[PDB]
Structure formats: C-alpha cells, structure tokens
Design an enzyme around this catalytic site. Structure first.
Site, PDB file in Angstrom:
ATOM      1  N   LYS A   7      -2.903   8.029   3.633  1.00 35.75           N
ATOM      2  CA  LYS A   7      -4.416   7.805   4.737  1.00 35.75           C
ATOM      3  C   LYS A   7      -3.638   7.571   6.054  1.00 35.75           C
ATOM      4  O   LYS A   7      -4.466   8.865   7.164  1.00 35.75           O
ATOM      5  CB  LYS A   7      -4.540   6.165   4.283  1.00 35.75           C
ATOM      6  CG  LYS A   7      -4.918   6.198   3.171  1.00 35.75           C
ATOM      7  CD  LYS A   7      -6.255   7.245   2.707  1.00 35.75           C
ATOM      8  CE  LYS A   7      -7.077   7.468   1.530  1.00 35.75           C
ATOM      9  NZ  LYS A   7      -8.492   7.719   1.237  1.00 35.75           N
ATOM     10  N   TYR A  55       0.779  -1.016   0.747  1.00 34.82           N
ATOM     11  CA  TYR A  55       0.120   0.142  -0.514  1.00 34.82           C
ATOM     12  C   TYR A  55       0.469   1.212  -0.145  1.00 34.82           C
ATOM     13  O   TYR A  55       0.539   2.486  -0.029  1.00 34.82           O
ATOM     14  CB  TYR A  55      -0.782  -0.495   1.455  1.00 34.82           C
ATOM     15  CG  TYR A  55      -1.738   0.503   1.968  1.00 34.82           C
ATOM     16  CD1 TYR A  55      -2.851   0.427   0.361  1.00 34.82           C
ATOM     17  CD2 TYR A  55      -2.772   2.244   2.407  1.00 34.82           C
ATOM     18  CE1 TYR A  55      -4.060   1.522   0.055  1.00 34.82           C
ATOM     19  CE2 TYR A  55      -3.394   2.772   2.128  1.00 34.82           C
ATOM     20  CZ  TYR A  55      -4.238   2.411   1.232  1.00 34.82           C
ATOM     21  OH  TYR A  55      -5.411   3.156   1.437  1.00 34.82           O
TER      22      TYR A  55
HETATM   23  N1  LIG Z   1     -12.024   0.336  -3.055  1.00 33.73           N
HETATM   24  C1  LIG Z   1     -12.201  -0.347  -1.707  1.00 33.73           C
HETATM   25  O1  LIG Z   1     -11.307  -1.330  -1.118  1.00 33.73           O
HETATM   26  C2  LIG Z   1     -11.279   1.101  -0.943  1.00 33.73           C
HETATM   27  C3  LIG Z   1     -10.981   1.252   0.316  1.00 33.73           C
HETATM   28  C4  LIG Z   1     -10.526   1.757   1.443  1.00 33.73           C
HETATM   29  C5  LIG Z   1     -10.279   3.317   0.544  1.00 33.73           C
HETATM   30  N2  LIG Z   1     -11.037   4.046  -0.356  1.00 33.73           N
HETATM   31  C6  LIG Z   1     -10.496   5.146  -0.503  1.00 33.73           C
HETATM   32  O2  LIG Z   1     -11.782   5.384  -1.357  1.00 33.73           O
HETATM   33  C7  LIG Z   1     -11.779   6.932  -2.320  1.00 33.73           C
HETATM   34  C8  LIG Z   1     -12.330   6.604  -3.396  1.00 33.73           C
HETATM   35  O3  LIG Z   1     -13.165   4.861  -3.781  1.00 33.73           O
HETATM   36  P1  LIG Z   1     -13.125   4.153  -4.790  1.00 33.73           P
HETATM   37  O4  LIG Z   1     -12.092   3.085  -4.638  1.00 33.73           O
HETATM   38  O5  LIG Z   1     -14.669   4.145  -5.052  1.00 33.73           O
HETATM   39  O6  LIG Z   1     -11.956   5.012  -6.165  1.00 33.73           O
HETATM   40  P2  LIG Z   1     -12.509   4.929  -7.357  1.00 33.73           P
HETATM   41  O7  LIG Z   1     -10.929   5.136  -8.797  1.00 33.73           O
HETATM   42  O8  LIG Z   1     -13.868   4.689  -7.587  1.00 33.73           O
HETATM   43  O9  LIG Z   1     -12.836   7.311  -6.643  1.00 33.73           O
HETATM   44  C9  LIG Z   1     -11.829   7.121  -6.582  1.00 33.73           C
HETATM   45  C10 LIG Z   1     -11.796   9.254  -7.596  1.00 33.73           C
HETATM   46  O10 LIG Z   1     -10.867   9.180  -6.993  1.00 33.73           O
HETATM   47  C11 LIG Z   1     -11.422  10.299  -8.870  1.00 33.73           C
HETATM   48  N3  LIG Z   1      -9.520  11.879  -8.197  1.00 33.73           N
HETATM   49  C12 LIG Z   1      -8.471  10.743  -9.050  1.00 33.73           C
HETATM   50  N4  LIG Z   1      -7.546  11.475  -9.234  1.00 33.73           N
HETATM   51  C13 LIG Z   1      -8.275  13.081  -9.166  1.00 33.73           C
HETATM   52  C14 LIG Z   1      -7.436  14.904  -9.464  1.00 33.73           C
HETATM   53  N5  LIG Z   1      -6.651  14.613  -9.168  1.00 33.73           N
HETATM   54  N6  LIG Z   1      -8.380  15.180  -8.983  1.00 33.73           N
HETATM   55  C15 LIG Z   1      -9.947  14.794  -9.282  1.00 33.73           C
HETATM   56  N7  LIG Z   1     -10.429  13.949  -8.983  1.00 33.73           N
HETATM   57  C16 LIG Z   1      -9.279  12.412  -8.617  1.00 33.73           C
HETATM   58  C17 LIG Z   1     -11.192   9.832  -9.411  1.00 33.73           C
HETATM   59  O11 LIG Z   1     -11.752  10.611 -10.730  1.00 33.73           O
HETATM   60  C18 LIG Z   1     -12.155   8.712  -9.361  1.00 33.73           C
HETATM   61  O12 LIG Z   1     -13.490   9.265  -9.679  1.00 33.73           O
HETATM   62  C19 LIG Z   1      -9.870   6.794  -1.955  1.00 33.73           C
HETATM   63  O13 LIG Z   1     -10.158   8.066  -0.829  1.00 33.73           O
HETATM   64  C20 LIG Z   1      -8.903   5.207  -1.469  1.00 33.73           C
HETATM   65  O14 LIG Z   1      -8.240   5.660  -0.257  1.00 33.73           O
HETATM   66  C21 LIG Z   1     -11.377   2.624  -0.992  1.00 33.73           C
HETATM   67  O1  LIG Z   2      -7.244   3.687  -0.535  1.00 36.94           O
HETATM   68  C1  LIG Z   2      -7.595   2.278  -1.151  1.00 36.94           C
HETATM   69  C2  LIG Z   2      -7.994   1.327  -0.556  1.00 36.94           C
HETATM   70  C3  LIG Z   2      -7.824   0.003  -1.239  1.00 36.94           C
HETATM   71 CL1  LIG Z   2      -7.761  -1.739  -0.485  1.00 36.94          CL
HETATM   72  C4  LIG Z   2      -8.532  -0.174  -2.308  1.00 36.94           C
HETATM   73  C5  LIG Z   2      -8.131   0.832  -3.130  1.00 36.94           C
HETATM   74  C6  LIG Z   2      -8.726   2.632  -2.554  1.00 36.94           C
HETATM   75  O2  LIG Z   2      -8.106   3.266  -3.131  1.00 36.94           O
HETATM   76  C7  LIG Z   2      -6.858   3.620  -4.348  1.00 36.94           C
HETATM   77  C8  LIG Z   2      -5.617   3.793  -4.101  1.00 36.94           C
HETATM   78  C9  LIG Z   2      -4.688   3.575  -4.795  1.00 36.94           C
HETATM   79  C10 LIG Z   2      -4.941   4.571  -6.066  1.00 36.94           C
HETATM   80 CL2  LIG Z   2      -3.630   5.302  -7.042  1.00 36.94          CL
HETATM   81  C11 LIG Z   2      -6.075   4.715  -5.887  1.00 36.94           C
HETATM   82  C12 LIG Z   2      -7.213   5.013  -5.257  1.00 36.94           C
HETATM   83 CL3  LIG Z   2      -8.961   5.337  -5.833  1.00 36.94          CL
END
Ligand SMILES: NC(=O)c1ccc[n+]([C@@H]2O[C@H](COP(=O)([O-])OP(=O)(O)OC[C@H]3O[C@@H](n4cnc5c(N)ncnc54)[C@H](O)[C@@H]3O)[C@@H](O)[C@H]2O)c1
Ligand SMILES: Oc1cc(Cl)ccc1Oc1ccc(Cl)cc1Cl
Ligand SMILES: NC(=O)c1ccc[n+]([C@@H]2O[C@H](COP(=O)([O-])OP(=O)(O)OC[C@H]3O[C@@H](n4cnc5c(N)ncnc54)[C@H](O)[C@@H]3O)[C@@H](O)[C@H]2O)c1
Ligand SMILES: NC(=O)c1ccc[n+]([C@@H]2O[C@H](COP(=O)([O-])OP(=O)(O)OC[C@H]3O[C@@H](n4cnc5c(N)ncnc54)[C@H](O)[C@@H]3O)[C@@H](O)[C@H]2O)c1
Ligand SMILES: NC(=O)c1ccc[n+]([C@@H]2O[C@H](COP(=O)([O-])OP(=O)(O)OC[C@H]3O[C@@H](n4cnc5c(N)ncnc54)[C@H](O)[C@@H]3O)[C@@H](O)[C@H]2O)c1
Ligand SMILES: Oc1cc(Cl)ccc1Oc1ccc(Cl)cc1Cl
Ligand SMILES: Oc1cc(Cl)ccc1Oc1ccc(Cl)cc1Cl
Ligand SMILES: Oc1cc(Cl)ccc1Oc1ccc(Cl)cc1Cl
Lengths: 274, 274, 274, 274
Positions: C161, C154
């Site tokens: 984070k 990560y």
């Molecule tokens: N999916 C998971 O398992 C997971 C787990 C824990 C936390 N998260 C967190 O959830 C959040 C995103 O959710 P997701 O997993 O649905 O990902 P996602 O790809 O669906 O959404 C991430 C968004 O960030 C936007 N983004 C990236 N760079 C940008 C920039 N320069 N300006 C404006 N927007 C920008 C992208 O367009 C995208 O819509 C993140 O903060 C991620 O750390 C995700």
């Molecule tokens: O924080 C995250 C945690 C998990 Cl388990 C899965 C997706 C996540 O979200 C990201 C992780 C890396 C990058 Cl480049 C962009 C995004 Cl939106």
C-alpha cells in the site's frame, strides 16, 4: 565531547526533572559552556543549584511575556559569553482550563496566551539573539505528537505545537543562509512539573508505555541525548526536522496487539485493565 | 442536487473571485439555501448582489474580531433559518509586512493578529453556531500548502494554517460525537482580492502552473466543487481531512522535468525563462 | 449526473459488498457507462448479475498476473467502448499466512506476490490502456492507513500500500501532462470478501467505530460516493491525492476518551469491553 | 565512544565513498567492532582494505538475492562475533532502464528486482540475524525523499523506498518487543558509485545545494554521524523513525527565493543558470 568549546543558552529549566535539564545535563557531559534563564525568583531557587551542578555561573531572568527581559538577555550573554553556538527553547503554557474539556470552549484569551508563550516566544528569542549566533549554531525547541494528531484534551496546545513546528520550518530557511540550524524534538509523555499538572496524565503515560513499539516510556536521559545530538555538529546536516524521541510511539495506527495472537487482543486489555 | 433543502452559512465573501463564493456557487447549483456574512459596510456593497444573485436574502454582519457580532449572527440565523447544515469558514488576515521579509521580523502584534482572525475565529464561529447545527452538519475551512511546507514569504500565515489544520483535527473529534464533520480544503494558488495584494504572487502562480502535474493552475470552479463535495453528504464518511485541490502540485519533491528527457531539463528553464 | 456520457473500467468486483461495487453503484447513479472485469469463472457468476444490474453488457476476464489477459482487455474496450474516461483499480492479495504473525516471517514468495498483484498491477493496467484514455481521464486505486501507520498484522500488505501510494504519486506526474488524474482512496475498515478472510477483522472494525471521530464505521455507500467524486470532473483539480474515507479515523493519535470526562476514560473500556 | 564494545554488521560497502562506509567510519571512531559484507569478488577488492583500515578481520560474502548467503552470514557472525548490537542495511538496486524514462514503462521483472534487493532484503537480513541481536540492538536502513514525493526519474525506486519505510515501521514493532530499534536515515543526494551512474545527477545535486535551507550538499561525514547516532544508545528512545540528513531540503514547498527580494526571484535563476 561533541560540544567542546561550544556555548549554549538553556531556556525552560524549572527543576531537575525538566526536559531542558535533561538536555543541559547531556550537553554538559559533552563539554558545553551553559547559560540558564528563569521565569521568576521562585524558579530561580531551583535553576541556580541546577546551574551550579553544571559548572555554570550564567543565570538570567527571562519571562517570555516581558519584552524588556529580552533586551537585558542580549546584553547579558554578549557580556558574559560574547557569543552563542546553540539555544534550547523548552517553554510552553496555557491556562489550566484550556487543557481540559474541548477546543470549542477555548476563550480567545487562553488561545493568545498559549500562542504567545508557546510559539511567538521562539521567534522573539531567536530574533533577539540572532546577531550573537555563531555560524553553524543550532536552535532546538520541544514539540509533541499532539501537533499533527489528536491527543486527548491537548486542545489549543495542539494548535500551538503545529504552529511551532511550522515556525521551525520557516526559521530554518531564514537562518539557513547564515548556516544556522533549527529543529524540533518531539518527545513522548514524560513526568515533569508542567505535566504533573495535567489531568489524568498517568493514563496518557500508561497508554504510551503499553502501546509504544519499545514498550516503555522515554527517559529524561533519552530525551536529553536526542536533544544534545540535535544541538551538536553530529547533526550539522539536519535542519527543519521534527525528530521523535517517543519509544517509537508515533508509528502506531492503533492500539498494540502483536504480542497476543490467540485471536489477537489489545495489549491494553491485558495490562492495567482486565 | 446533493444539497437540496440544505442550509449553509458562507463566511468570507469579498467579491465574486473569493474562494468562498466559488464554493457558494457550486453549493447553489446543488440546491442549498445560502446565507452570507460581510466584514464591513464597504464589503456589504459587494456581498449583497451576490447573495441576491444566488437566491439569498439572509445577509449578516460579521467581523471575527468583534465577539458581540457572533451573538447577533446566532440570533439572526436562528430566527431566519432555524438550523444550519453546513458552515464555510473562508477567512484569513495578517499585516502586509508580516507576509514579506522573514518570519524572524514578525511582531507579537501581527502574530496575534494572524492567529486570531485566521484560526481562533473558526473556533468561535463553530462553538457559537454549534446548537444550531443539524446532525450531519459539515464545517469547511481553507488552508494552503504553506502550513506544512516552506513557501515564499508566507511566514506567519504558514504558522496560522498549521494550527488551523490541527484545529480541524480536534474540532472533528469534539463535534464528531454529535455527527458533525470538520474538514479543510488546501487549495492551490489562485488569483483573488486577498492574493492579488500579496508581493510577487504572479511568480508563485506561474511556478505551480509549470511544476504542477496537471500543468495548470486550479480554477475557481474546481475549488468550489471540491468544497461542495466536502460539504455534501457525498463525503459523509470524510472528516479531519486536509483535502488538496492543487492540480497535484503537493506531490512534487522538486521542479518538474518529465516531458523533456534528452538530458532532463527543468520545465521552468524552458517555460518563461530562456 | 456528473458522469453522463463518461466511460470507465471497473476492476476488482467479487460480489455486491466489494468496494469496487460501491464505487460502481455510485458512478452508475451519475450516468456513467460501465465495464467490468473478473478474476475467474467463479467470480464471474457474481460479477455478471451485478453488471446487468447497472446497464452494463461489457464483461471481460482479467487476472492481473496473466500478461495475455491485458492484451485481450485492450482489444476488448477498444472495440466495445472506443475509449475510457476513468479507471477503478480495486485489487489486492497476499497469502493468508503473510497477513498474520509478523512481517519478519514473510517469505520472499509472499512478498513478491503481494507486491505484484497489489502494486505492479496498477502500473500494467494503466500503461496498457493509456492509448485509450481520453483527456481528463481519472485513475482511482484503493489503499489503507496501514501504508503509513502500523496496523495489526497488516504486514507486507502495509508495504504494498505504501509503494502503491507512491506509485499513485509518480503516475500523476507521468500522466499529468496529458490531463489525466491519478488518486488513491484510503478507505477505513469495512466488511467484504477479502476482509472476512482476515484474522480477527471484527476487532479492527470495532476499534475504528469506537475510536473514530464520527464514532461509526464507514458505509459501502460513503466509499463509493467518495470514489465517484474522485473519478468525476468534480475533482478535476485533484491529483496524486491520498483521500481518506474513514469516519475521520486517521486523525486519532490514541484511543478516544472525550465523551467521558469524570477522570477521562477510554471509550473502549466502556464499549464492547466493560 | 558511544559504541565502545558494540559489535555491528555493515552491509553495502562498495568503496570509500559509500554511505555505508561513512557510517562505518563514524561508528569506528565511537569504539565499535565492525564486520562487513560484499556482493561479489569484484567488490571484495575494495571492502577488504576498508575493513582492514577500520580494524576489521570479519569480511563476509552476501548477495541478498541468494538465500544461502544468509545462512552462511548467520554462521559467520555467530562463530566470529557471538552476537550483534547493530546492523547497517545500505543496499538498493533497480535496472538502469527503470530509473529513466517513466514509471509507466517499468517491466514486471524490474519491479520485482527493485522491491526484492531494496526492500525484502531488510526483512531477511533482520530475521536471519535476529537470534544474534542483543537487547537494545539498533537496525538502520537508508531511504530517499523520493519515497513520499516525486523526484525526477526516481520512479520504481521511489516505490521501494516507500515500502522500505513502511517495513521500518512494522519491523520496529516486531523487534521492539525485544527492545531492538529499527529506523531509516533519509539522506540527501551525495556522490557515490551507484549515484554517479544515475542520469542527470549533477542537476539533482546542484538543485538541492541551491534550494536547501543550509544552502549546501550534505557530506559523507554528516550522513555518517547521523547514522552512528541512530545506531547508538544515544538514540535508545527513537524507533520507527525516518530521519532526514538533507541540509533541511525536505522542508521546501517550492524553490528557494529568500536572499533575493527585489521582486522575489528564484535562487536557481541566479546560480548556475542565467
Ligand atoms: N475492505 C476494506 O476494509 C478495505 C480497506 C482499505 C482498503 N481496501 C482495498 O480495497 C481493495 C479491494 O476491495 P475489497 O475490500 O472490496 O476486497 P474484495 O475482495 O471485495 O475485492 C478485491 C478484488 O481483487 C481481486 N483479485 C485478487 N487477486 C487478483 C488477481 N490475481 N487478478 C485479478 N484480480 C484479483 C479479487 O477477485 C477481488 O474482486 C483492495 O485494494 C484493498 O486493499 C479495502
Ligand atoms: O487492504 C485492506 C485493508 C482492510 Cl482494513 C481490509 C481489506 C483489505 O484488502 C485486502 C487485504 C488483504 C488481502 Cl489478501 C486482500 C485484500 Cl482485497
Ligand atoms: N513533559 C512532556 O511529557 C512533554 C512532551 C512533549 C513536549 N513537551 C514540551 O517540553 C517543554 C516543557 O518542558 P517540560 O515538559 O519539562 O515542562 P517544565 O515545567 O519542566 O518546563 C517548562 C518551563 O517553561 C517555563 N515557562 C512557562 N511560562 C513561561 C514564560 N511566561 N516565560 C518564561 N518561561 C516560562 C516554566 O517556568 C518551566 O521552566 C514544552 O515546550 C512542552 O510543550 C513536554
Ligand atoms: N487565494 C488563494 O490562492 C488561497 C490559497 C489557499 C488558501 N486560501 C484561503 O482562502 C481564504 C480566503 O479566501 P481568498 O483567498 O479567496 O481571499 P478573499 O479576499 O477572497 O477572502 C478573504 C476574506 O476574509 C475576510 N476577512 C478578513 N478579515 C476578517 C475579519 N476580521 N472578520 C471577518 N472577515 C474577515 C474578508 O472579508 C474576505 O472576505 C483564506 O482562509 C485563505 O487563507 C486562499
Ligand atoms: N547516494 C545518495 O545520494 C543516496 C540518497 C538517499 C539514499 N541512498 C541510499 O543509500 C544506499 C546505498 O548507498 P550509496 O548511495 O552510497 O550507493 P553505493 O554504490 O555506495 O552502495 C550501493 C551498494 O548496494 C550493494 N548491492 C546492490 N545489489 C546488491 C545485492 N543484490 N546484494 C548485496 N548487495 C547489493 C552494492 O554492492 C553497493 O555496495 C541505498 O539504499 C540508496 O538507496 C543514497
Ligand atoms: O507540551 C506538552 C506535552 C505533554 Cl504530553 C506534556 C507536557 C507538555 O508541556 C506543557 C503542556 C501544557 C502546559 Cl500548560 C505547559 C507545558 Cl510546559
Ligand atoms: O492563505 C492564502 C494563501 C495564498 Cl497562496 C493566497 C492567498 C491567501 O490568503 C490570504 C493571505 C494573506 C492574508 Cl493577510 C489574507 C488572506 Cl485571505
Ligand atoms: O536511492 C538513491 C537515491 C539517490 Cl538521490 C542516489 C542514489 C541512490 O541509491 C541507488 C539508486 C539506484 C540504484 Cl539502481 C542503486 C542505488 Cl544504491
């Protein structure tokens, strides 16, 4: 050494593989004057030679469940040593059943037995010897990750260590006034009489060695030195601290993999499991 | 409502200010069928109308120190409701002395009393009703910051809540196999029967009020909604969680000062202390 | 619903599997008036129908690295909605390379990008709309256990984070006075656009399912429901909180074993790894 | 001593009051051969004599903001010392504005400067020197409670320190494979060049003195000995740990009151404030 002219009471020795022994050994090398206690005459059979090996002629009986033993103890150290600079509280127990199966099936009996012997005993021991503690004295107890995290079948012992750690926090404020320190050393799994009785402990030990950052199990010497540090003036600015001596195991949020990166595989699926 | 047709057992109601009631009130507005328990006949004099006020005819006796009461509880709900979807564990007790002075003076008696009524009871209550719990069931208990941090003359109650939160973690693993959830709601200080009967509570209350980020004390409604949530399917992805409903107080590493920047002065020195 | 007459900005939607979408869907079902932003025209192609699907005609362009977009945004919602009751900050990014191998190899350039887009953006987004936030407004961002625990590769995102959770803590104190709440929802792994691009994500997912207390992966709906709660008045007594929605995963201090007790075997060595 | 024949790099000495110096001092008394570094020539005037007094002829220039300085460092230690047993990362910087007012007003610029000098530098420092790190080497950095709790106007520095501890967690796993340890020493407030220039610092200091359990402020010697411990084989079982040398302050959940129990009053309301 850093414990020269310092007097300390060691409670918990059962054999030369005891955590308290590692700590006593380390404390000995730093010039400390030690005193030991034993649960019954059977353990005294081992605590005595150990005691001699560490230039100590102070060996007393102390079963934390017998309140009169505390009264004798107070009279003993006051007569034989006049005062105490540090205390080692390395005692815990719970019925064998309590540590297998789930927490749900725990009997009220096993609960209390584990709480009393493993937590309250720190309170009684510390209150009892309070007036004999010199300024700057240090009080060290032993805990385990299982207090704040779920560890397979640790169960009620987990509830105890959590209370134990809290107690450390409250005891550090109660005695901080009089400049006395209190901490908990959170050791990682290690082979000792108590552990060799726990079901499939060899597994817990393998999971830690393989997934711990340093990729190894902590030695009795390492635990002893961390303890010694915590009990010495080297750490006079440290209190109410839960200090981990687990080869870095506490940081892991999941199984290690880092070394293998082809597609990233669990180190576990490659070591002692293929 | 997010609890329509959902059956829950409410343990801990003393009067209409009890945390357990606030959570009950909230679950009620969500369509949950409620069942209450009282400690003694004296309390039944207050738990009765309340149950009636919230549409409940299922009122049972339950003193967690009496094991035979638990078997009756079981038979009572198994006959009246057939199943349970959510259980509320809002109980805690310790002698008055133990909550004043220092943790050091605590007696083996008060210790075992604090731990039994306030921690082991969650284990017996749960393990007892276990075969009456539907898939998706939710078990909530109540804790306080004192569990992992020092709070004024919380003493032995702090040890209890530390094992409580650790019990919430193990129960979640024990009952997770069966799709059941276990959480703890760490509420901030709030005026109730039990709290009003605690020394200087007025002060802990004002301090949290001034030093809390939302600059106020939490209401009974807010605690109830937090719980209702933890007990509703809305949190079906949450478990083994100590959820803080304290107006953000838990985040502070010192007294507030923020609004006043001139030279930075503690809000406490400006509010009710000039 | 508990969001009737409430207006909120949703930032971070890329497609219908996005966390920000689940959160949006849930808020919609509760009477919330929504508004959305999009990174570029390619994502706008997916953010548009989604926006329509939720009775929302407010769609603005916002690339967190473009300071001018924020100035437009302020002007936009001031005109289109007058004010905001809640905000969802669901944005994160870091070069593919930084999310593989070790933290040691991270370039200064990737480090900054990851900190800027993933952390500072919350600061700028909040500071910019601050004048349009009604009392009781709620700010919700997303984090992952990798903040406080090491999680496979990560890396720098782990550092982001953690700064992000600390940001959440400082912003709650800054806006707390104005009755505005700030929280973080720490979701468990779940398949989405950004994650589908991560090396061996399937494994992170499998590991959580087998080792999590509820023994399953969290659904997109469970994340949304949690977020909706965090953004509604239901949690008006919650602030600066890192709320876990991971099927109880955060409690584990090692791989699950429970179901198998003959000799106590790792559930992993029996599921998707025989 | 416990570092006899052990070679270490000390980064961050500004004067005889620096944390880096106290640690160096304690390490020097334990037999270590030291090497130091300075930011600019204006600091070389204070580092040279300190390095001389501590027996060191190895004084190199290093402004973490300049990548070329890292290549020279490598060449400087490889030629002058051959290898390194321990590294002290005691560096942090953020614009004066950033550390006053609110975290909300922070500029993108100051955000990047704080993160880079205070966090990324640990990554470059360790990765550059990596090939010169012997087995069992130890890497120590400095953090502050502001990393996980709100501390007055600590603001962006609080985010940095939180990422810093997370980096300590990931680096510990990256270098553990090679038996190298990575930890963080979280010291309590103490008078140094950098702190002396901080707004209302005497207050932060008096507040920790009165509210800390040991009722004092930590000395440079205590922080020094705690770090020497972390950097020695004495702690070869410890890694990824954030170790608190704060007179036990971190345990407090509220202001102190203890000693006074007439109605239970804050120790603050009686000391230096009437
Ligand atoms: N999916 C998971 O398992 C997971 C787990 C824990 C936390 N998260 C967190 O959830 C959040 C995103 O959710 P997701 O997993 O649905 O990902 P996602 O790809 O669906 O959404 C991430 C968004 O960030 C936007 N983004 C990236 N760079 C940008 C920039 N320069 N300006 C404006 N927007 C920008 C992208 O367009 C995208 O819509 C993140 O903060 C991620 O750390 C995700
Ligand atoms: O924080 C995250 C945690 C998990 Cl388990 C899965 C997706 C996540 O979200 C990201 C992780 C890396 C990058 Cl480049 C962009 C995004 Cl939106
Ligand atoms: N060994 C490990 O892997 C490990 C890990 C973390 C923490 N700990 C903790 O270390 C301490 C125990 O040390 P150990 O693991 O070396 O086990 P051990 O068997 O060597 O020591 C435990 C001692 O407690 C004594 N004891 C038990 N009941 C007593 C009572 N009624 N009155 C007085 N003494 C009593 C035993 O006689 C024994 O000497 C415990 O607090 C344990 O929880 C051990
Ligand atoms: N009041 C607060 O500010 C606060 C803060 C944090 C946590 N809590 C927790 O909330 C819970 C109680 O709620 P409250 O604070 O509203 O107090 P309360 O007076 O409203 O409720 C306490 C309940 O515990 C019950 N109880 C005590 N001993 C019992 C026993 N032997 N058998 C059966 N029932 C017994 C009493 O009957 C009573 O209903 C406790 O777990 C307490 O620790 C309260
Ligand atoms: N002083 C405290 O009460 C306290 C408390 C907790 C943590 N800390 C931490 O201790 C460390 C600093 O020690 P201090 O408090 O003795 O302050 P200090 O003034 O003695 O040291 C700060 C050092 O950082 C160096 N530095 C700044 N920018 C640099 C750059 N770009 N390149 C190379 N060096 C640079 C300066 O030269 C200076 O020597 C910091 O990490 C600080 O966050 C201090
Ligand atoms: O706390 C411990 C943790 C571990 Cl990993 C190993 C041994 C421990 O110590 C005990 C555990 C159970 C019982 Cl019945 C008695 C003792 Cl001394
Ligand atoms: O746990 C609590 C925490 C707070 Cl701040 C206030 C009241 C609490 O509740 C109790 C405290 C002591 C006893 Cl003997 C019984 C109960 Cl129900
Ligand atoms: O982190 C710290 C914490 C405290 Cl309580 C005191 C001083 C600290 O150190 C710094 C703080 C700000 C800047 Cl700009 C530079 C440094 Cl070295």
């Amino acid at each position: 050494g850093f414990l020269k002219g310092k007097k300390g009471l060691i409670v918990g020795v059962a054999n030369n593989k005891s955590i308290a022994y590692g700590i006593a050994q380390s404390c000995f090398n730093q010039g400390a004057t030690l005193a030991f206690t034993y649960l019954n005459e059977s353990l005294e059979k081992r605590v005595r030679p150990i005691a001699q090996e560490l230039n100590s002629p102070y060996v007393y009986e102390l079963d934390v469940s017998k309140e009169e033993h505390f009264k004798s103890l107070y009279n003993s150290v006051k007569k034989d040593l006049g005062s105490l600079d540090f205390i080692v509280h390395s005692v815990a127990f719970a019925p064998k059943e309590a540590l297998e199966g789930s927490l749900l099936e725990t009997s009220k009996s096993a609960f209390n037995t584990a709480m009393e012997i493993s937590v309250y005993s720190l309170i009684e021991l510390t209150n009892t010897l309070k007036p004999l503690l010199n300024n700057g004295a240090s009080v060290l107890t032993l805990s385990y990750l299982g207090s704040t995290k779920y560890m397979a079948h640790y169960n009620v012992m987990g509830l105890a260590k959590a209370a134990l750690e809290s107690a450390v926090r409250y005891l550090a404020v109660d005695l901080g006034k009089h400049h006395i320190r209190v901490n908990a050393l959170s050791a990682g799994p290690i082979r000792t009489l108590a552990s060799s009785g726990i079901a499939d402990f060899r597994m817990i030990l393998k999971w830690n060695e393989i997934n711990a950052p340093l990729r190894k199990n902590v030695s009795l010497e390492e635990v002893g030195n961390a303890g010694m540090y915590l009990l010495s003036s080297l750490s006079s600015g440290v209190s109410g601290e839960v200090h981990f001596v687990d080869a870095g195991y506490h940081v892991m949020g999941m199984g290690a993999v880092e070394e293998k990166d082809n597609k990233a595989t669990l180190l576990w699926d490659l070591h002692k499991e293929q």
